[PDB]
């Protein structure tokens, strides 16, 4: 079946790679929709890090 490594790439990347490698016999129902209308950001896992130095959140105040 599909790879369960949620922290490696996205679901689309893993599914496409497995289909190309022939592990997945048939593409899932959602694959064509994702290919046609991908989201703005690929859902790649990312570990959040807290800022430590001069870097600060760019969220400007509303005035």
């Amino acid at each position: 079946a599909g790879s369960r490594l949620e922290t490696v790439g996205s679901i689309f990347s893993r599914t496409r790679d497995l289909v190309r490698a022939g592990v997945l016999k048939e593409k899932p129902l959602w694959f064509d929709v994702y290919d046609a209308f991908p989201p703005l950001r690929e859902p790649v896992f990312q570990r959040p890090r807290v800022r430590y130095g001069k870097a600060k959140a760019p969220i400007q105040d509303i005035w």
Binding site: A1, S3, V8, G9, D17, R20, A21, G22, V23
Partner: protein, 338 residues
């Protein structure tokens, strides 16, 4: 007497002593079936019963009770003894296994394809290889020192899709089954350049294990750590160099190898990222420029910076080898085909 007789199974259970004080905690004989070579209607008197041990009809006529001659019965006994001896020899001999990295090691030993999936899924294209078999003990009050087996298993279809898993079990075969059935659900897809090698050199440090992989041309072979050789065979990589430094922990080595291989950047991705043709220069092909990658989107007309000096963190071993100062008596040793 007769009523004191028992069944074969009960007698074997009593004689083999599979359970008891000695076998309870480990504070040689084996079962042999006596019915495999015995035919109904055969006795020491050598009688021929029509319909049970001999054909009911001979020459289209009903057979009668017949008794084999003494010489014929001797021949039958000799045939029975010969069959028993041949079966005993066949059972004693075995098809010798293919040893792994060493005769008594479990690494490199193939386990066959993983068990088929329930929903019509088969993994006959996948090969399973053992990488480490450790006996792990724990201190429990109830049982003293509890023993278990942890097995590291790598699987792969030889076409990029490969994975690894860890199986904990009280029984070694159960650990193998668990690990090899869990690995196929954790399959990385490793991109291979020209379906034989990695796309570029990979320098990684997973925990305390440094892995340095060098892309190599066709026919260079796998000059890598034996575990990396096995994993690359599972992936489908045929030419690569790999040096392991620091801790050589097998689990960390496998995890770092898979991390680096999965995180490698393909030529097409580089071309799309920087919007420039990725052109290959080969010494054997002379000055011919081979455009191995081209950007999907619009091409970048920026002639790119002609960096006079590249600020790249070199490795001292590579520079020493290139300059010839390295004189290790173990490098470039002739070895069997990998």
């Amino acid at each position: 007497s007769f009523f004191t007789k028992l069944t074969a199974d009960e007698l074997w259970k009593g004689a083999l002593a599979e359970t008891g004080a000695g076998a309870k905690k480990g504070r040689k004989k084996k079962r042999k079936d006596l019915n495999r070579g015995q035919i109904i209607g055969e006795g020491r008197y050598g009688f021929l019963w029509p319909g049970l041990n001999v054909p009911l009809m001979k020459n289209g006529a009903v057979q009668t009770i017949a008794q084999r001659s003494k010489e014929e019965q001797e021949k039958v006994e000799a045939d029975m003894i010969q069959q028993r001896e041949e079966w005993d020899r066949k059972k004693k001999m075995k098809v010798k296994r293919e040893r792994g990295w060493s005769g008594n090691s479990w690494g490199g030993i193939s386990l066959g394809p993983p068990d088929p999936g329930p929903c019509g899924e088969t993994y006959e294209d996948f090969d399973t290889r053992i990488l480490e078999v450790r006996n792990v003990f724990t201190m429990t009050a109830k049982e003293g020192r509890k023993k278990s087996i942890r097995v590291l298993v790598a699987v792969g279809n030889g076409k990029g899709a490969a994975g690894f898993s860890i199986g904990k079990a009280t029984d070694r075969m159960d650990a193998f089954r668990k690990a090899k059935n869990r690995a196929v659900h954790h399959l990385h897809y490793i991109e291979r350049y020209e379906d034989h090698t990695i796309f570029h050199d990979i320098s990684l440090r997973f925990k305390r294990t440094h892995i340095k992989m060098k892309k190599q041309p066709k026919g260079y072979g796998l000059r890598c750590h034996r575990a990396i050789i096995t994993i690359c065979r599972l992936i489908g990589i045929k030419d690569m160099y790999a040096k392991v430094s620091g801790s050589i922990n097998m689990l960390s080595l496998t995890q770092g190898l898979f991390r680096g291989l999965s995180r490698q950047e393909t030529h097409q991705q580089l071309a799309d990222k920087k919007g420039l043709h990725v052109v290959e220069i080969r010494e054997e092909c002379g000055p011919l420029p081979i455009v191995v990658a081209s950007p999907r989107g619009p091409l970048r007309k920026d002639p790119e910076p002609e960096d006079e000096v590249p600020d790249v963190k070199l490795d001292w071993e590579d520079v020493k080898t290139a300059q010839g100062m390295k004189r290790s008596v173990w490098s470039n040793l002739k070895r069997a085909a990998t």
